[PDB]
Nucleic acid binder design. Structure first.
Ligand SMILES: [Mg+2]
Ligand SMILES: [Mg+2]
Ligand SMILES: [Mg+2]
Ligand SMILES: [Mg+2]
Ligand SMILES: [Mg+2]
Ligand SMILES: [Mg+2]
Ligand SMILES: [Mg+2]
Ligand SMILES: [Mg+2]
Ligand SMILES: [Mg+2]
Ligand SMILES: [Mg+2]
Ligand SMILES: [Mg+2]
Ligand SMILES: [Mg+2]
Ligand SMILES: [Mg+2]
Ligand SMILES: [Mg+2]
Ligand SMILES: [Mg+2]
Ligand SMILES: [Mg+2]
Ligand SMILES: [Mg+2]
Ligand SMILES: [Mg+2]
Ligand SMILES: [Mg+2]
Ligand SMILES: [Mg+2]
Ligand SMILES: [Mg+2]
Ligand SMILES: [Mg+2]
Ligand SMILES: [Mg+2]
Ligand SMILES: [Mg+2]
Ligand SMILES: [Mg+2]
Ligand SMILES: [Mg+2]
Ligand SMILES: [Mg+2]
Ligand SMILES: [Mg+2]
Ligand SMILES: [Mg+2]
Ligand SMILES: [Mg+2]
Ligand SMILES: [Mg+2]
Ligand SMILES: [Mg+2]
Ligand SMILES: [Mg+2]
Ligand SMILES: [Mg+2]
Ligand SMILES: [Mg+2]
Ligand SMILES: [Mg+2]
Length: 86
RNA sequence: CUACCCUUGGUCAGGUUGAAGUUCAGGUAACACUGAAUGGAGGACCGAACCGACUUACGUUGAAAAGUGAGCGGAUGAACU
RNA sequence: CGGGUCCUAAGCUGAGGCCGACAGGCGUAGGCGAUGGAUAACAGGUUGAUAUUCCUGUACCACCUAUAAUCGUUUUAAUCG
RNA sequence: UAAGGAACUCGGCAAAAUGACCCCGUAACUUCGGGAGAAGGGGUGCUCUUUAGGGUUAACGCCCAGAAGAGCCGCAGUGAAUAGGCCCAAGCGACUGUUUAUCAAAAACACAGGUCUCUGCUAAACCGUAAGGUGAUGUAUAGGGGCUGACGCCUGCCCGGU
RNA sequence: UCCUAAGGUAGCGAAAUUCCUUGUCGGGUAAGUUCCGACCCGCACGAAAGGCGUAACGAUUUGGGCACUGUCUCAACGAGA
RNA sequence: CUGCAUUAGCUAGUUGGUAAGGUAACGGCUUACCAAGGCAACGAUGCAUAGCCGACCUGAGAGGGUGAUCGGCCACACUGGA
RNA sequence: GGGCGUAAAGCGCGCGUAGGCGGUUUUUUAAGUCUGAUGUGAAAGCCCACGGCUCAACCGUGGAGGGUCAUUGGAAACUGGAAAACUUGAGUGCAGAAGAGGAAAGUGGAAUUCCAUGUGUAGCGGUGAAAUGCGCAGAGAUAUGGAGGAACACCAGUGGCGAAGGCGACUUUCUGGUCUGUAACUGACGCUGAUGUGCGAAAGCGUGGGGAUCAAACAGGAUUAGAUACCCUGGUAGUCCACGCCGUAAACGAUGAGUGCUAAGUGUUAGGGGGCCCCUUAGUGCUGCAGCUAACGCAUUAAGCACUCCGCCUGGGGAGUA
RNA sequence: GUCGAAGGUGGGACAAAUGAUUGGGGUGAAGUCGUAACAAGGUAGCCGUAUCGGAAGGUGCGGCUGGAUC
RNA sequence: GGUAAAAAUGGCAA
């Protein structure tokens, strides 16, 4: 995804100004990137190498979503409805 | 008459099975996929009309120059008319 | 009411035309040709023998004649097409 | 129709047996569809009592349709009539279908599929002396002809002869 | 060693093909020229005049069970033409 | 406190509830009714094998093997039912 | 109280689920842990002591011991639980870097084969030597043109990239990962990974397309005792493309992954920093201590020293068979 | 009358024995055929795969060194 | 660059 679009996503989900590392920001950007590669894979179904990157991104999102639910369930519930992930 | 064909018409009680697809639920990164429900496929199933003619008995100067009786096959189809 | 004085399918025929010892074959325009399209009447009564056909009652369709509310009256704006 | 029960016979030919509906249950094998109604069993009348319902109605009523229990009668309750016999193997043909009108219905024909070959379009092929047609108002994923015949696994060697 | 264009492969096999032949052995039967399995000395199988399998299907051909019975032992009686 | 996954599904009185009956007694123990539960890779279900233990044999120990005599508990009494 | 480079043994390689394991500080709790008390763990036996049998065996008596036991009282370091912090791990941002990483279109040039003509002539081709073959119906050779498929010389390097298998003309589009610096941010969010789930050379299989080259099978020639080979001339599948299937290789570093620690010297790839030199990060080679090893060897790219987790081994054959 | 041992009937499951015949394995004469591997084993060998051949094996494709004189 | 081609076999003991 473009740095412009990424920056827009950070601003939408940043917990505080200057926040770039919160699970919310990281999950949101990951969600965008997963969708973009899923789009690539629809046209290019035999780009196995790119799909592997997508699999790693899905796992990293899962692990952060696991951590957030563990720490703050409200923050989790708000993030999943906002990003439409479940 | 009969064979095939052309054009235009008609007919096929009732019962059964339950394809694809779809929807919902679950499931997935997205798909596969799973379960219900829905759906109504087929030279599909059983069985009358109808069409046929496997067996057998009768009939054999016949009721009949090819039939009758009892069973028998198909019966939405390459159907029958 | 069914058919004709309506329509066309397959098919048949076919002015000229094309082809062919002859006879004749083929074929265009155009015709003909229902098994289909279009198309205005029903109930009751009645004979030994006919009936949506006769009769009784109540209808419908096309056309004609007359009188016509109204509308028009020649680039026409009433009307046919 | 005693007793027997295929001893009959070329051969169970014919006959007998099975048969309805409901419930339980159901194998090898398989192309996963099937096989299957597999098979093998159980129930079925009438009366009374209690009692889930559904359709149509304001309701009543009417129509449909169960369940449980307790009784009654006969040799027997789909009390008549009508309604699969079944199973295990082997050959052949995949299959539905077609055929010797009137001695053969089949393992024969056809078939979807395979393959070879011809054919560039006024196509090849076919009918006609021709004209004119079919092919096709189609155009090589098409059309004619030969052979093979679902599907699965396969399909070896020989071009000397014709 | 001789010959050929090349010498039949896989699979299958007393077979819708096997003369000899009721081959031989095993199974099934009290007893089986049929049948099934196996064997291979294939008279004279063999790969699209296809080879070998094959679920489903068959008024197909074939062998064996269960049930059933006047088919039979072996006939008898009754109804009707 | 036992082996086997070349045993992965198992169960319909089954899991729970309600009521009644029944038992010294609690309880699906049983029976109607209602619901769809219960169990299982932390090995259910199946199959095989086996009485269990105090002990006993061995081993430096940790372990391994075994379950005579004696004592405890359980089960059985020709087989099966009452 | 053993191992898995070469002896038997690292899954071909990822993505991940359960499970196992997990950085630093504080506070608290007390499940594990530690320390007592109480009850109980029959008797017999074992063990120890003593006593009785002439001794011993044996008999008797008293201790001692035997729980993964229960109940209850303390301790709190560690493990666990709870609460609150931290930034070193792990990520994110920001600023840079290189790359045959992947997918899909498009564009080139060399060469091979075939076909068409011109010139031209008696061979060409091939081998150890031959022959089959091709050619005289004009071959081969040479010149020019056309058709088609496949692969990309030079660059090119123990070079680069990728989890592995792999990836080499160029262009564009889409897309994955990695490294350096910085220290915005988050704040242990981590590691491994049974069962799962994907990817996976080549050959092979299915459907459709394509067919230059090479080439199982197959056919000639030759060699040979024979030659079902090696060599020669041909040649089909296949080799190529698409989409499915297969799921295996000495899929190898015969070396599982993660983390930290432990002499040096030298080359190279992509960076960073400071004065050609020095320092530094991540790769990639060679050489070589300590240590390790049966030896060979390995040696900061461990096969050294450690901790976590997974897979695997237990004589050979039968057999990777039934 | 309910329940009910034993018994009967039926379709399945599992186990063991046996069966014409057939398959590979093992062992055992100094049997027959060839010579595939070990040396550059006389075509380096081996791994996966495909196909072919009396037999070991051959050949194609990819891979490995656990090969490669000068 | 090469390269000459062909080039089989030989009981178990001690
Ligand atoms: Mg039918
Ligand atoms: Mg009849
Ligand atoms: Mg039928
Ligand atoms: Mg029928
Ligand atoms: Mg005419
Ligand atoms: Mg005229
Ligand atoms: Mg008419
Ligand atoms: Mg009259
Ligand atoms: Mg009798
Ligand atoms: Mg009798
Ligand atoms: Mg007889
Ligand atoms: Mg007789
Ligand atoms: Mg009969
Ligand atoms: Mg047939
Ligand atoms: Mg038929
Ligand atoms: Mg006839
Ligand atoms: Mg007949
Ligand atoms: Mg035929
Ligand atoms: Mg042939
Ligand atoms: Mg015989
Ligand atoms: Mg024949
Ligand atoms: Mg033939
Ligand atoms: Mg045939
Ligand atoms: Mg016992
Ligand atoms: Mg010891
Ligand atoms: Mg080894
Ligand atoms: Mg490895
Ligand atoms: Mg004691
Ligand atoms: Mg390939
Ligand atoms: Mg060659
Ligand atoms: Mg392997
Ligand atoms: Mg380094
Ligand atoms: Mg050799
Ligand atoms: Mg060799
Ligand atoms: Mg060969
Ligand atoms: Mg010797």
């Amino acid at each position: 995804i473009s740095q412009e679009r990424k920056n827009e996503i950070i601003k939408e989900y940043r917990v505080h100004e200057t926040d770039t590392g919160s699970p919310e920001v990281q999950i949101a950007v990951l969600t965008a990137e997963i969708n973009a590669v899923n789009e690539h894979l629809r046209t290019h179904k035999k780009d196995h190498h790119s799909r592997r990157g997508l699999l790693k991104m899905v796992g990293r999102r899962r692990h952060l979503l696991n951590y957030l639910r563990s720490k703050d369930i409200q923050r989790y519930r708000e993030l999943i409805k906002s990003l439409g992930i479940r």
